Design a protein around this nucleic acid. Structure first.
Ligand code: MG
Ligand code: MG
Ligand code: MG
Ligand code: MG
Ligand code: MG
Ligand code: MG
Ligand code: MG
Ligand code: MG
Ligand code: MG
Ligand code: MG
Ligand code: MG
Ligand code: MG
Ligand code: MG
Ligand code: MG
Ligand code: MG
Ligand code: MG
Ligand code: MG
Ligand code: MG
Ligand code: MG
Ligand code: MG
Ligand code: MG
Ligand code: MG
Ligand code: MG
Ligand code: MG
Ligand code: MG
Ligand code: MG
Ligand code: MG
Ligand code: MG
Ligand code: MG
Ligand code: MG
Ligand code: MG
Ligand code: MG
Ligand code: MG
Ligand code: MG
Ligand code: MG
Ligand code: MG
Ligand code: MG
Ligand code: MG
Ligand code: MG
Ligand code: MG
Ligand code: MG
Ligand code: MG
Ligand code: MG
Ligand code: MG
Ligand code: MG
Lengths: 141, 102, 150, 55, 115, 109
RNA sequence: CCCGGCGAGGGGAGUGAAAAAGAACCUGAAACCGUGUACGUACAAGCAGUGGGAGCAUGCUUAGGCGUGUGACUGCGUACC
RNA sequence: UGUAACGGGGCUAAACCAUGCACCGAAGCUGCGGCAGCGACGCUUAUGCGUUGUUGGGUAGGGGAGCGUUCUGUAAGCCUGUGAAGGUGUACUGUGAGGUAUGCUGGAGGUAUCAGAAGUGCGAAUGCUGACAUAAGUAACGAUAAAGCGGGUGAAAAGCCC
């Protein structure tokens, strides 16, 4: 006998909503990366994108402990001669509040095509409003 | 109706009627075998063990084929140390058809 | 090998692999590293080993019943037609005829016959006795062989 | 100057993809004679736009 | 006596190239390159007969850990609960019962709850 | 009928002719004959003669019918090269190959 | 006979048992370059395999299972001397 | 050269100090097969073993037992135009070198067994010879004295002829 591997076509996915108001970034982004991958589901397979679609809303209201509101830097190179752009967690929330959750999830997801596929699942928003009422996404905690 | 039993030092989740492969036995080619090594019986009432085995749970099976497996080649090779070792293997098996679950 | 001594090209400078001969075994034409010479493949066999072997193979034919001992065995005239017919009465085929009194009549008319081989009792051999299916010996020939081997 | 180690059949294919020269697929038809020719060129017999302009 | 060694070479090359049949580029066609690929393939084939057993054992534990936390228990407690009631069912099967008969998997979680 | 016709030991190379061949495949003989008239390559004149052979070849010997004839399996195969010795500077010699090609065409319906 | 430059080369017809025995002429391997057919391949990084593996293309007997080809995605994996 | 002194995300516990109980984790160990190498002996007798304990990573190196090739003997026997060798595929089979049977090609030799003898097995030697790749349809086409148009020839003319 062999063990049951998941088969994409048969994968009945689900949609979720996550209010990120007053959540700790890492503790959230972990719990997302667990779901996005699909390890919460009992029919998990390490080569199939079984994990669910998540709509994280109120991304700008996310909390961080200690002095990481100022001290957490986000370095990124530009691929250029000496362009090493940086940004503090304040400055990132002022500019692009979606990026914050997205990076913290992207780091925790696996690398590779499946890794990128299971990130596409995630949908992040600054405002409380979202435009996915057609899916009836259930409230996840 | 399906059940779980150990035979070749390892378990097999088998149903009544179907065929299954397992590690070699010292039995004839067309002879019945009785396993009293049942670990679980699933039905309406899911019978399980709090001890070694159930209580009176027998599995009668009928031996079908007494064949050898697919060849498995074995290349032990060390790099730059002037040494390789070819070798082959065809592990034996016994195939059994399950008649009844008690 | 028939070739020049000359280094085909100089040691260094050129990108090619250092050589000093067009007669060297790793070149097409001229070489054979270990060329054999005409040699004497024959080997010593001890007198008593040889005699003992002939005794041992000649002893086995009595158990096999290949050995046929006979009296005055001689063809009338040098003709294969008679010899070929007289083996049918005796009921033989592939034979080694051995005689002490070597009749020329019997020899002459057994060259072309292949399954028959005529010898003198003096000239018996190890491979000869073993090779042929039947063996034919005259009472004089066995007397000579018995006395020779002892 | 010089390659480090040789390219493949594949790469050599990939490169040659663009060498495939295009066809004409745009033959004219002379009005009087009905002969085919390149656009704006004369015909091999000697016509252009339904008028003989060559010996 | 001289021995031409033309028949035997191709015999032993064709054996190897037939194993490499499938590989990319020269690794299929060319003997010198194929021979290495065929051996390294053997090395890996040997090496992964061992890893096959590990990977699947991870894969089962994952399924069981997932299936248990649906019913409200972490794997580490679920196994210790089963072992404390002298239950002998291995991972391979637990991972099957996790997927298939969830009514049966539920009763294992109760069986483990006692301890 | 399949009706083959070919040019063996064609003095132009394989790669150069194989480039023209591309313009004729699954194509109607009448259409393919025209293209090669107004393609500017040496291989066009070479491949035309072989096709224009194949049509007469087909109509006279076996098949008849010139209208319905599509060029199916045209292909060029590298033929026997001829090694000539171009001398270079500083005394070194270079073997230039005068390459040849076998040009087959199959004109069916 | 046919196309072709009263050519090179080819195609039919015909000799022969056989002309993928047609003068390069027995057999005709490999590298090498081709033509069709099946699957894969234009958001994806690395000794290019290996263990898993859906899909897809396909054959058998059965009324359900097996084999061959391909190999998306994924764990491990820095050639040989 | 770029965060670049947790492997990364990230963390106020997911850091630290101490106690306890869990689990994961190797080719370690146990489980069920299969093989070989040794040493005891039930007393069999030249050996299956009722067994028993045991070992089995390996360079230099030492020691065992084999596969295959060509050739000579058994062989004027035996297999072959009712298809040999060679080539090319497939399906079994052996722990391995390898074997066996058969469809296509090939169109004439082959060789069991057990012996005997070797020019006896190659991926490397900037090895030798041949063939074919690569860069690549890339550089170059040999003086910077210079060509142009018309008519002819011929399948075809920038280059030939006038
Ligand atoms: Mg990553
Ligand atoms: Mg050099
Ligand atoms: Mg010589
Ligand atoms: Mg030698
Ligand atoms: Mg290099
Ligand atoms: Mg290369
Ligand atoms: Mg490429
Ligand atoms: Mg010879
Ligand atoms: Mg072999
Ligand atoms: Mg000079
Ligand atoms: Mg002419
Ligand atoms: Mg033929
Ligand atoms: Mg030739
Ligand atoms: Mg002949
Ligand atoms: Mg030939
Ligand atoms: Mg190619
Ligand atoms: Mg894509
Ligand atoms: Mg890369
Ligand atoms: Mg790449
Ligand atoms: Mg890796
Ligand atoms: Mg710096
Ligand atoms: Mg950092
Ligand atoms: Mg444990
Ligand atoms: Mg050892
Ligand atoms: Mg050990
Ligand atoms: Mg012989
Ligand atoms: Mg021979
Ligand atoms: Mg043979
Ligand atoms: Mg044999
Ligand atoms: Mg023997
Ligand atoms: Mg040698
Ligand atoms: Mg070689
Ligand atoms: Mg070597
Ligand atoms: Mg060098
Ligand atoms: Mg070189
Ligand atoms: Mg050479
Ligand atoms: Mg070249
Ligand atoms: Mg270039
Ligand atoms: Mg250029
Ligand atoms: Mg240029
Ligand atoms: Mg120049
Ligand atoms: Mg110039
Ligand atoms: Mg002129
Ligand atoms: Mg000019
Ligand atoms: Mg000029």
């Amino acid at each position: 006998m062999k063990t049951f591997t998941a088969k994409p076509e048969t994968v009945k996915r689900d949609w979720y909503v996550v209010d990120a108001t007053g959540k700790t970034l890492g503790r959230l982004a972990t719990e997302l990366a667990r779901r996005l991958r699909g390890k919460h589901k009992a029919e998990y397979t390490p080569h199939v994108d079984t994990g669910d679609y998540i709509i994280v809303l109120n991304a700008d209201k996310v909390a961080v402990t200690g002095n990481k509101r100022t001290d957490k830097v986000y370095y990124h190179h530009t691929g250029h001669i000496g362009g090493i752009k940086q940004a503090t967690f304040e400055e990132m929330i002022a500019r692009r509040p979606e990026r914050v959750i997205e990076i913290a999830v992207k780091g925790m997801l696996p690398k590779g095509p499946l890794g990128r596929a299971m990130f596409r699942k995630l949908k992040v928003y600054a405002g409380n409003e979202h435009n996915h009422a057609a899916q009836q996404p259930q409230v996840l905690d | 109706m399906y059940a779980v039993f150990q035979s070749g030092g390892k378990q097999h989740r088998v149903s009544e009627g179907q065929t299954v492969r397992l590690e070699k036995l010292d039995i004839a080619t067309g002879e019945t075998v009785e396993f009293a090594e049942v670990l679980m019986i699933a039905n309406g009432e899911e019978v399980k063990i709090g001890v070694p085995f159930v209580d009176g749970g027998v599995i009668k099976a009928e031996v079908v084929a007494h064949g050898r497996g697919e060849k498995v080649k074995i290349v032990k090779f060390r790099r730059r140390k002037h040494y390789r070792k070819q070798q082959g293997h065809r592990q034996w098996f016994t195939d059994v058809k399950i008649t009844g679950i008690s | 090998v028939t070739g020049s001594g000359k280094k085909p090209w100089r040691q260094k400078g050129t990108g090619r692999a250092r050589s000093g001969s067009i007669k060297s075994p790793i070149w097409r034409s001229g070489g054979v590293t270990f060329a054999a010479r005409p040699q004497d493949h024959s080997q010593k066999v001890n007198k008593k080993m040889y005699r003992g072997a002939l005794k041992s193979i000649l002893s086995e034919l009595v158990r096999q019943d290949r050995l046929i001992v006979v009296e005055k065995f001689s063809v009338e005239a040098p003709k294969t037609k008679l010899l070929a017919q007289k083996l049918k009465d005796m009921a033989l085929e592939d034979v080694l005829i051995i005689t002490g009194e070597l009749d020329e009549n019997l020899f002459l008319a057994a060259r072309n016959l292949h399954k028959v081989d005529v010898r003198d009792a003096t000239g018996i051999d190890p491979v000869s006795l073993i090779a042929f299916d039947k063996v034919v010996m005259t009472a004089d020939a066995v007397k000579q062989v018995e006395e020779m081997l002892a | 100057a010089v390659q480090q180690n040789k390219p493949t059949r594949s790469k050599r294919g990939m490169r040659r993809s663009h060498d495939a020269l295009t066809a004409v697929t745009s033959l004219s038809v002379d009005k009087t004679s009905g002969e085919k020719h390149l656009r704006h060129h004369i015909t091999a017999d000697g016509y252009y736009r339904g008028r003989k302009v060559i010996a | 006596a001289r021995v031409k060694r033309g028949v035997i070479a191709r015999a032993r090359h064709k054996k190897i190239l037939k194993q490499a049949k499938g590989y990319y580029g020269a690794r299929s066609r060319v003997y010198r390159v194929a021979f290495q690929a065929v051996i390294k393939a053997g090395q890996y084939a040997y090496r992964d007969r061992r890893q096959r057993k590990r990977q699947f054992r991870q894969l089962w534990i994952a399924r069981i850990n997932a299936a248990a936390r649906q019913n409200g228990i972490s794997y580490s407690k679920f196994i210790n609960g089963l072992k404390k009631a002298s239950v002998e069912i291995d991972r391979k099967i637990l991972a099957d019962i996790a997927v298939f008969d969830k009514v049966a998997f539920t009763a294992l979680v109760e069986k483990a709850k006692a301890a | 009928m399949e009706t083959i016709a070919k040019h063996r030991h064609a003095r132009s190379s394989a790669q150069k002719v194989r480039l023209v061949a591309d313009l004729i495949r699954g194509k109607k003989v009448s259409q393919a004959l025209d293209i090669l008239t107004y393609t500017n390559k040496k291989a066009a004149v070479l491949v035309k003669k072989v096709l224009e052979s194949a049509i007469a070849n087909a109509e006279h010997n076996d098949g008849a019918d010139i209208d319905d004839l599509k060029v199916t399996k045209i292909f060029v195969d590298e033929g026997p090269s001829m090694k000539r010795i171009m001398p270079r500077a500083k005394g070194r010699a270079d073997r230039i190959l005068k390459r040849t090609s076998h040009i087959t065409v199959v004109v069916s319906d």
